[PDB]
Amino acid sequence: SDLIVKDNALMNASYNLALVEQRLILLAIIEARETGKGINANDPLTVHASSYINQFNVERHTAYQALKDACKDLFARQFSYQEKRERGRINITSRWVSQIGYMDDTATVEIIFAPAVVPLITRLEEQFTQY
Amino acid sequence: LIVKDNALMNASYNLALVEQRLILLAIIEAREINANDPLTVHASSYINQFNVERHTAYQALKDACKDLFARQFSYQEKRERGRINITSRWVSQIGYMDDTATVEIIFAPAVVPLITRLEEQFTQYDIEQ
C-alpha cells in the first residue's frame, strides 16, 4: 500500500540523519506538544537550545550552534518513493523540511516539515527515541 | 531587514525560463493553491502555450522540476526578541509520471502567499506568447 511504501522509504532515509538532526526533530515534536501547537505543513515549529540542554544534557555552549548546523544539514536532504494517482503511479521526491530559520539572539531555531513527512511524524518520534 | 517579497522576487530572476514557465503553468492549470496539495502540469499544456520543441518538452519539464527543487532563497523577519534568518525552498515536493507526460509540484509555504505576484511577473514576461 502507499502508506507502507512511503513509511519504508522515510525510515530507510532516516538512518542517514546525524544524531543532532534526529534530536532536532524530536525536540520540535516535544516542544510543539508542550506549547499546544499541532504539526502541519504550514506552521513553523520552534526549538530552543535550552530544551536541547534540558532534554539531552549536551555541552551548553555548543548546543545552539549544533542545532543551527543541524537545521542546514536536514534542509539539504531528500527522499524518494512512489504513490498511486488516478491515472497511474507517480515518482515523488520530497524534502524533510520546507523551511528553516535561526535566531542568534534567543538561541532558537524554527522548522516546517514537508507535507509528505507530516503524517509520519509519530513514526519518526518512535524511530528516534532512545532509552 | 531582508524582506521576503524582495528576496523571493529577486530570486525569481535566477530561474531558468523553463522553471518560470513550469510555475506559471501550475498556477494556470490550478485556476482552470496551498502548501499541502500537489499541482499538476501537463507537457501538452506546455507545448500548447509556448514556442518549445514538442519532442523534448516533457523532458525539459522533468529537468526544470529537479532544478527548481534544488533551489533556495533566504530572508529575515522581525520577532519579539530579535531578527530571524529564514531559508526556504521554492517547492517542498516534486513528482513525475512518464506514461502521461505530467509533472507535479507542491509550493513551499513561504511562496504560497506570493503566488499572485509571481503569476503577474511571469505573465508580463511571456505576454507575447
Q: How close A48 gets to chain B, by Cα (Å)? A: 13
Residue ranges covered by each domain of chain A:
1-131
The technique by which this structure was obtained is X-ray
* C-alpha span between A81 and B64 (Å, rounded): 19
| Residues on chain B touching A89 (C-beta within 8 angstroms) | 97
DSSP A5-31: HHHHHHHHHHTTS-HHHHHHHHHHHHH
Contact yes or no for A22/A128 (Cβ under 8 A): yes
Among candidates B62, B71, B74, B70, which has minimal Cα distance to B22?
A: B62
> Which residue's C-alpha cell is 526578541?
B81
Binary contact (A88, B97; C-beta < 8 A)? yes
For an interface test with B, the pick among A91, A104, A117 (most B C-beta atoms closer than 10 Å) comes out as A91
Q: Which CA distances in Å does A71 have to A17, A38, A45, A94, B1?
A: 11, 20, 12, 16, 21
Contacts of A66 (CB under 8 A, 6+ apart): A20, A52, A58
Among candidates B53, B43, B17, B47, which has minimal Cα distance to B126?
A: B17
Q: Nearest 5°: CA angle at B56, between B53 and B57?
A: 75
Contact yes or no for A100/A74 (Cβ under 8 A): yes
Taking one residue from A and the other from B, the number of pairs with CB-CB distance under 8 angstroms is: 93
Contact yes or no for A18/A95 (Cβ under 8 A): no
Q: How far is the first Cα of chain A from the last one, in angstroms, to the nearest whole number?
A: 31
> Which residue's C-alpha cell is 503524517?
A119
The x, y and z cell numbers of residue A73, run together, are 544539514
Among candidates A54, A44, A52, A94, which has minimal Cα distance to A69?
A: A52
Binary contact (B97, A89; C-beta < 8 A)? yes
Q: Which residues pair with A93 in a beta bridge?
A: A80, B94
Contacts of B74 (CB under 8 A, 6+ apart): B2, B7, B85, B86, B87, B88
| Residues on chain A touching B58 (C-beta within 8 angstroms) | none
> Which residue's C-alpha cell is 507535479?
B104
Q: How close A119 gets to chain B, by Cα (Å)? A: 11
For A116, the closest chain B residue by CA position comes to B93
Which one-letter DSSP state was computed for residue A102?
A: E
Contact yes or no for B77/B1 (Cβ under 8 A): yes
| Residues on chain B touching A102 (C-beta within 8 angstroms) | 84-85
* C-alpha span between B35 and A18 (Å, rounded): 27
Edge-to-edge strand order for the sheet containing B82-89? A45-48, A108-113, A97-103, B82-89, B72-79
Contacts of B47 (CB under 8 A, 6+ apart): B54, B57
Contact yes or no for B30/B119 (Cβ under 8 A): no
Contacts of B44 (CB under 8 A, 6+ apart): B101
Binary contact (A110, B81; C-beta < 8 A)? no
Alpha helices in chain B (DSSP H): 4-12, 17-31, 43-49, 57-70, 115-125
| Residues on chain B touching A114 (C-beta within 8 angstroms) | 92-93
Contacts of B119 (CB under 8 A, 6+ apart): B24, B27
- Chain B within 8 Å of A105 (Cβ-Cβ)? yes
* C-alpha span between A1 and A8 (Å, rounded): 11
The x, y and z cell numbers of residue B119, run together, are 503569476
Q: Which CA distances in Å does A21 have to A60, A74, B57, B103, B126?
A: 17, 6, 39, 31, 42
Phi and psi torsions of B110, nearest 5°: -70, -25
Among candidates B88, B38, B91, B40, which has minimal Cα distance to B68?
A: B91
Resolution stated for this PDB structure, in Å: 1.5
CB < 8 Å & 24+ apart, contacts of A10-16: A10/A79, A10/A81, A10/A116, A10/A117, A10/A120, A10/A123, A10/A124, A11/A123, A11/A127, A13/A77, A13/A79, A14/A124, A14/A127, A14/A128, A16/A77
| Residues on chain A touching B72 (C-beta within 8 angstroms) | 75
Cα torsion at A28, A25, B86, A61 (round to 10°)?
90
Residues 34-93 (A) with a CB less than 8 A from some CB of B: 40-42, 72, 75, 78, 83, 85, 87-93
> Which residue's C-alpha cell is 513509511?
A7
Contacts of A131 (CB under 8 A, 6+ apart): none
